[PDB]
Amino acid sequence: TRLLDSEIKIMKSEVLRVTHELQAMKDKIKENSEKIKVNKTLPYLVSNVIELLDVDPNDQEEDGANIDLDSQRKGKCAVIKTSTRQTYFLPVIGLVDAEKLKP
Amino acid sequence: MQIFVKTLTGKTITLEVEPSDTIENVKAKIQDKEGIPPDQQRLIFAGKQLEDGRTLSDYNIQRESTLHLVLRLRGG
Amino acid sequence: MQIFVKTLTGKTITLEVEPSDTIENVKAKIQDKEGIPPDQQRLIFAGKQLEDGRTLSDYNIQRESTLHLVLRLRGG
Amino acid sequence: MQIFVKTLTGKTITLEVEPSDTIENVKAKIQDKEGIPPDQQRLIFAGKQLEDGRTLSDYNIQRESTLHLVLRLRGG
Amino acid sequence: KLLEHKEIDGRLKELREQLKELTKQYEKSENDLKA
């Protein structure tokens, strides 16, 4: 049978997407990293880690009213002691990888 | 072409578009028409969500189809 | 069994109906004879507001009753 | 077991699959090797379309059988 | 000849080879804001 080029008519569609995705992501990283940077004002407190905990979701769940933090956490969590003698539980560690901490 | 998009309020809007337009251009036209920001509004068609990354032909939006608009609902 | 309708403009419309007809039907008859969309029509009969799903003899409307049309305007 | 897969592009590839592997999972393994999203893949054996959920044994695909790849319309 | 058709086909390789690289980075860039 006589061949035909019908393949390209489907194949070519993805290019218009991907050429813009590869640019849009490397655009957004600019604003995203600056939005992180502008948060980090240097007057930090200082404080000591007291504990590292292994956390497991609850037995039961809900919608219309569920919390991202009670269930629906699965990694590590921490407990820290501030200088001004507070003790805080932390549900999300933050901008440091939990592997490198120890009490 | 002409396209009809209607909202949870009962107000309805008609847009002019060409098949090569992307969703983002739709939302921009809506903002021009009404002042809602492009990040707030969500669109629905044929019971599945729209997303940017695609042309209006790609979802097979035909002449005089109807779209649903629904707002971002945030509070805190 | 004759019925008079009064619109906001004061034009009078004559209807030949039956006591077991329904409001949907008379609203449609008006749609046919004047061109107004049915669902924009609201019917007023003294104080009561008439509901589509039930029949004239339930409201015991009588011969040559005068009956008001009101337009629920829509936002734009 | 080994199968031939011939594309209409003209490339032929040998793939190791089990008679119980579903056609959708075969599409997944092709997407593993070639990357091609499975929605673009139509797999044909003996001139007949292969159902994603069916297995080689349902289509009774024997030793070293050949499948043909068609660039279909995706689902979307 | 079909050679130029495969030359155009080349671009899907060209781009998927790059998004396969970026997707591991942009995930973290999102998550470290979400935190």
CA distance B17 to chain C (A): 21
Question: Largest Cα–Cα distance in chain E?
Answer: 54
Q: Are A48 and A78 in contact (CB under 8 A)?
A: no
How many Cβ atoms from other residues are within 10 Å of residue C23's Cβ?
A: 19
Contact list in A for residue D71 (CB cut-off 8 A) is 7, 10-11
- Quickly tell me which residue has 């006591």 as its tokens: C19
- Residue B45, both tokens: 């068609």
**Residue B54 exposed, middle or buried by CB count within 10 Å (0-12, 13-18, 19+):** middle
B53 Cβ under 8 Å from any chain A Cβ:
yes
CA nearest to D52, candidates D72, D29, D23: D23
Strand D48-49 vs strand B12-16: parallel, antiparallel, or unpaired?
unpaired
CA nearest to D61, candidates D18, D12, D8, D7: D18
Q: Are C56 and C65 in contact (CB under 8 A)?
A: no
- Residue B48, both tokens: 């599945």
How far, CA to CA in Å, does C24 sit from each of B50, C50, C53, C54? Answer: 37, 10, 7, 8
Contact list in A for residue D10 (CB cut-off 8 A) is none
CA distance D35 to chain E (A): 8
Q: Are C11 and C69 in contact (CB under 8 A)?
A: no
How many Cβ atoms from other residues are within 10 Å of residue A91's Cβ?
A: 12
Q: Tell me how many helices (H) and strands (E) chain E has.
A: 1, 0
Angle at A26 between CA E9 and CA B41, to 5 degrees: 95
Q: Which residues in chain B are immediately followed by a break of C to N over 2.5 Å?
A: none
Stretch (H or E) spanning B43: strand B42-45
DSSP result, A26-77: HHHHHHHHHHHHTT--S----EEEEEEEE----S---SSS--SSSSS--SEE
3-state helix, strand, coil in chain B (%, to 5): 15, 30, 55
Q: Order the strands of the A87-90 sheet from edge to edge.
A: A47-54, A76-82, A87-90
Local structure of B68: helix, strand or coil: strand
Local structure of C62: helix, strand or coil: coil
- Residue A91, both tokens: 């549900």
DSSP letter, residue A85: S
Strand C2-6 vs strand C66-71: parallel, antiparallel, or unpaired?
parallel
Residue type, E6: K
DSSP letter, residue A93: -
Strand C66-71 vs strand D2-7: parallel, antiparallel, or unpaired?
unpaired
Contacts of D15-20 spanning 24+ positions with Cβ under 8 A = D17/D56, D18/D56, D19/D55, D19/D56, D19/D57, D19/D61, D20/D55, D20/D56, D20/D57
| Contact check, Cβ <8 Å, B53/A21 | yes
E15 Cβ under 8 Å from any chain D Cβ:
no
- Residue D7, both tokens: 């594309």
Whole-angstrom Cα distance, residue D58 to residue D61? 8
| Contact check, Cβ <8 Å, E16/D35 | yes
Please, which residues bridge with residue A54 across strands?
A76
CA distance D74 to chain A (A): 9
Q: Are D50 and D13 in contact (CB under 8 A)?
A: no
Q: Tell me the resolution in Å.
A: 3.8
Q: Order the strands of the B2-7 sheet from edge to edge.
A: B12-16, B2-7, B66-70, B42-45, B48-49
Strand D66-71 vs strand D48-49: parallel, antiparallel, or unpaired?
unpaired
DSSP letter, residue D66: E
Q: Are D33 and D13 in contact (CB under 8 A)?
A: yes
Contact list in E for residue A38 (CB cut-off 8 A) is none
Contact list in A for residue E8 (CB cut-off 8 A) is 8, 11-12
Whole-angstrom Cα distance, residue C3 to residue C15? 5
Whole-angstrom Cα distance, residue D9 to residue D36? 13
